[PDB]
Design a protein around this ligand. Structure first.
Ligand SMILES: CCCCCCCC/C=C\CCCCCCCC(=O)O[C@H](COC(=O)CCCCCCCCCCCCCCC)COP(=O)(O)OCCN
Ligand SMILES: CCCCCCCC/C=C\CCCCCCCC(=O)O[C@H](COC(=O)CCCCCCCCCCCCCCC)COP(=O)(O)OCCN
Ligand SMILES: CCCCCCCC/C=C\CCCCCCCC(=O)O[C@H](COC(=O)CCCCCCCCCCCCCCC)COP(=O)(O)OCCN
Ligand SMILES: N[C@H](C(=O)O)[C@H](OCc1ccccc1)C(=O)O
Ligand SMILES: N[C@H](C(=O)O)[C@H](OCc1ccccc1)C(=O)O
Ligand SMILES: N[C@H](C(=O)O)[C@H](OCc1ccccc1)C(=O)O
Lengths: 416, 416, 416
């Protein structure tokens, strides 16, 4: 039973084994001058992995933001809801700004030049500011859904979800059942896409093996230092995010951070091992139960925080969208970084935590900046940043779960 | 509480105030030579209003015509249903023909030449008649839904709704629950789009202010006379529609029109004040109760007439699609006017009455004629016709409610 | 009552009458040199028929394969399910291979050259093998759904259906109701498309009359011999399919074929007369009851076999996609025939049997080979193969029902 041996084996150790064997086989076949053979016989598996993730980008955008804007809408929110939603959004924006800062303080992907076709990627000239601020609103929702265009789909999905929740509180019965049926169908589409991404991340060791094999064979030993710089920038940014943001917010609101980080050890460690937010929700509820938090103020925010409070994933956005920019020669302008901040805050507003979906949110961010996955240079830089996704997901899920308990404790010790 | 002051204030007086202040500020800044400044600092708000309405065009088309063809279908209709549906369609066609006649008898938008880019809008050459009569049927329903193409979406939506009602009367159970689930999801999409257009028409005073400010600053005082000609043509056409059509039909069918128009005073006046058809449905039912109409012959037609019997909105189509044509230098050919008649009859077959959706049906009509909102001349002429939408909606809702009671009385006094 | 006379008249005799009168009127108007008049005054009706079928292609693909992959998925299958699903797929593949063989052994559509615009259809050059094997997976599911692209829609629909069934077996309640709501909405879309194709095949006599009239007037008497060669190739292939495949499989598994083909006479004959698979399901259940088949092993496979076991329809695919290739001068390469095998196996995985849907599966096959219905030569060859669809559907439904009882008997006499 080779198939039942392969699936029952755990995912994280499998991707780590595929990554290590991919680096070894890629460097060995790159020393022997076998780069074109390993290219034409190995690289299509990683291309299939990249194409499966790019397939799963857009329905996750539409359905997840409809459901999440249906879970965040001002039609059904109290004081605790607004009080923690403004905290979650204002923390995600400062986390992606810290990701920009930590990508500027290091140099992820410098030195290497990824002109794979013989020409560098030249960025198309930016429109005026009012043209992009008007082109956020789509002319056609099916049109903006039918070819790329992450930001108009984001706007239309948020507006449609807020309208669905305003529809579910009317005196009529037929429109209430109709809005409930539409919201349940879109929620089923979102959860079906999450089951497909669970299957794709089950396939993911072979794709990581192929991508890292081709990358180590073509670029050489010179790329593992820049990947180590990427890992160092991400983990230093996450540690400084935890320290600065959560510790200063807890000391302003009067909660001692050492006892908090002692009590949150289980909720951090099971998110480090099992790289999921929805899978660590009973452990997070147990940690919030053993802290002194009231029942109706932790039994509402933690299922909301497992959906709308990706704090480390936005820092990974801010580091990775600058690594992919610096690994192509170009650089992002001021006015293209606020697009990263907007499309890293509004993307993590409905996505439930499944392992390996930051690789989908990365294409969501890149498709709105001007670095699309159709050009051959971004498809190589995204491969280089996708090959080390498993050693970053364990980092960017722990702070994603830590921010939930931080916001729950801050909202708890300002009302009672 | 500036926001709760702004929303709780009524909509119609707000749009009238924004229109008057927009005309005043536009003429004053046009006398001082400040046209480029008011352009680049004011016109994007009206562009955002136009882009929100153009966003809301196409899902209203698909979902509203699926629901309305599900409410008009020959699978579930008696004698009264066919007897009033053929009346409603044959009255809407003659109303849009009277709109064409009243646009020809006046001259809406003559004299002005809207070459904003330095070139006039040249119409693309028409295909043969059998090419457009075959291109009514789409090759791809998702394809015709994904880029414009109002008439193929209209055809596919009507066919899908008739198929849904033929599906809901079968002996099986699974396909009955499946058709009910699909129809309820599409109905929820339609009502969600109507809640979005209620929000957009709540935003609408700032957009009307910006559009009329830019229009009075660029074109000058010479455009308010043509807008007055448009209002005069619309209201003369609506008054002659009421008089000729309803009075001669009531005198042929033997009902005295003076006592009818005395009894229908509440249903006319509350539709003039509150510019809605669904909002005046209990008042219309009360007026039909105080007329001598049988219970099962007024308790069926008035919720149907509030959906499929827009008689004044089609006259506004027939006047406005000729105003936008005459304000660009071109003229509509015979064979392009039957497209206006078809896309003004089939558009008002599922749309429930919400205030300010004639501006969406106008883009529905214009996108099928050859005057799309992407070219810069039609986006200015549509702005000029959109800035005075509030002083036309009160006119074109009163006859829209009057035709309901007229058809109810005609169908009542031919059976009992 | 001309309309109620026309609809209540049976469909098959109506299409046969339209075919015979179309051939007669086409040959008579072709002898008098009246080809351009019968073209410009008759051919648009057949073009409307072709456009209605091309409209109904793509939603049947998406919805039918979502439902059929939801009915074939490995999440809910026993030993009997896998045992008969691998039989059905391995029989459909050998049936379409026998269709390729029977199209090679005859010469369907040779001699005639269909350069209607003055130029022959030149095939676009094929990409490498790994490019098409990677382009099976879409980059955008709404994108691949929005312009043609049958194979990416097929892949995404099968993956989404398997994910829906894996979603309907979880411990949560909200995601179970959500997956059930999404699957029921897609099933309602599929059954609505089947009701539309029932209406289009009700219209079909006028379209068959127009297509055969234009074909006999333009090409002449020389095309009825090649159409007779097509009918002979299809029926010889179906008879050899029955004989070889079913008789050798029944003699290997130890069931006497003469008593089987004596008992299956009702289920063959009512499928020959009423050309449907879902309409002959009680007769097929009655035949399996009068054979010696256990209750839980014939009450599961025959509603599955009426959906996923089109054996003669795949042979009609294999003959017709080579007739349309040979009637244009070009020829299909090895590597374009495995596309026919794949898109003739995976297409008949969710489609319930309705009369005249092989004309839709033919466009499904042709749109993935490189013979699209937009070029004017394939739109004439598809007309020539569509005009004789009624005298082929009776053949390709009988073996479609016979394979159900064959697989049921084979699966029955290997377990008990
Ligand atoms: C070379 C050919 C490789 C092609 C790979 C294409 C991958 C497509 C993924 C599409 C997933 C289908 C829908 C998802 C269904 C699903 O969730 O089951 C998933 C199973 O799907 C898969 O893993 C298929 C991937 C197999 C590729 C690996 C091949 C191993 C070869 C060994 C030699 C697992 O979900 P789960 O989280 O483990 O939950 C278990 C529930 N009992
Ligand atoms: C400059 C920035 C302007 C951007 C404007 C963009 C407008 C977007 C409209 C999208 C609507 C969201 C979904 C609709 C939700 C909705 O129906 O609530 C609607 C509220 O939404 C809005 O009105 C937002 C519009 C605010 C723009 C006006 C700004 C005033 C500034 C004053 C200084 C009202 O519905 P209702 O009929 O009054 O029923 C009340 C129920 N209690
Ligand atoms: C020249 C103009 C020809 C235009 C033809 C366009 C055809 C469009 C077909 C769209 C079908 C609408 C949705 C399907 C509704 C439907 O299923 O009813 C279907 C009725 O729809 C039709 O057949 C309309 C086709 C009429 C075209 C033939 C004209 C005869 C002229 C005689 C002179 C029949 O379904 P059924 O299987 O018989 O079940 C009966 C249930 N009591
Ligand atoms: N690890 C994070 C989590 O599960 O919470 C992260 O969350 C998924 C996610 C977060 C934001 C946007 C899309 C998808 C991931 O797994 O990539
Ligand atoms: N005033 C009319 C009404 O509400 O009945 C009119 O009706 C909305 C309508 C009518 C026809 C097509 C689309 C939308 C409008 O408000 O613009
Ligand atoms: N005659 C066959 C049947 O009904 O079983 C055949 O089945 C329909 C079908 C079969 C395969 C793919 C699509 C549609 C047809 O009618 O064309």
């Amino acid at each position: 039973g080779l198939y039942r041996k392969y699936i029952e084996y755990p995912v994280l150790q499998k991707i780590l084994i595929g990554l290590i064997l991919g680096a070894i086989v890629g460097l060995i076949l790159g020393h022997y001058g076998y780069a074109h053979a390993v290219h034409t016989y190995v690289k299509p598996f990683g291309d299939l992995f990249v194409r499966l993730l790019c397939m799963l980008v857009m329905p996750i955008v539409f359905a997840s933001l409809v459901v999440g804007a249906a879970s965040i809408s001002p039609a059904r929110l109290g004081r605790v809801g607004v009080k923690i939603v403004v905290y979650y959004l204002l923390t995600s924006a400062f986390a992606v700004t810290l990701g920009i800062i930590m990508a500027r303080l290091f140099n992820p992907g410098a030195g290497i030049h990824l002109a794979v076709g013989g020409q560098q990627f030249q960025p198309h000239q930016a429109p005026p500011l009012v043209h992009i601020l008007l082109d956020i609103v789509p002319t056609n929702p099916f049109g903006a859904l039918a070819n790329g265009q992450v930001l108009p789909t984001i706007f239309f999905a948020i507006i449609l979800g807020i309208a669905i929740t305003y529809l579910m509180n009317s005196e009529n019965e037929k429109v209430r059942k109709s809005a409930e049926t539409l919201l349940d169908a879109i929620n089923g589409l979102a959860e079906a896409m999450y089951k497909i991404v669970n299957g794709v991340m089950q396939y993911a060791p072979i794709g990581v093996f192929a991508l890292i094999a081709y990358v180590m064979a073509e670029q050489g030993v010179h790329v593992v230092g820049e990947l180590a710089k990427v890992t160092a920038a991400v983990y230093v940014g996450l540690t400084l995010q935890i320290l600065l943001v959560y510790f200063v917010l807890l000391k302003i609101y009067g909660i001692d951070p050492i006892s908090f980080i002692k009590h949150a050890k289980d909720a951090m460690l099971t998110a480090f091992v099992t790289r999921s937010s929805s899978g660590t929700l009973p452990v997070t509820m147990r940690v919030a139960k053993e802290m002194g938090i009231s029942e109706g103020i932790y039994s509402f925010t933690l299922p909301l925080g497992a959906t709308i409070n990706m704090d480390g994933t936005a820092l990974y956005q801010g580091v990775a969208t600058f690594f992919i920019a610096n690994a192509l020669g170009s650089h992002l302008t001021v006015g293209q970084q606020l697009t990263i901040v907007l499309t890293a805050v509004l993307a993590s507003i409905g996505t439930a935590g499944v392992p390996g979906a930051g690789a989908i949110m990365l294409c969501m961010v890149l498709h709105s900046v001007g670095l699309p996955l159709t050009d051959p240079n971004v498809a190589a830089a995204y491969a280089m940043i996708l090959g080390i996704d498993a050693i970053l997901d364990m980092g960017r899920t722990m702070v994603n779960v830590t921010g939930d308990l931080t916001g729950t404790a801050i909202v708890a010790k300002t009302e009672g």
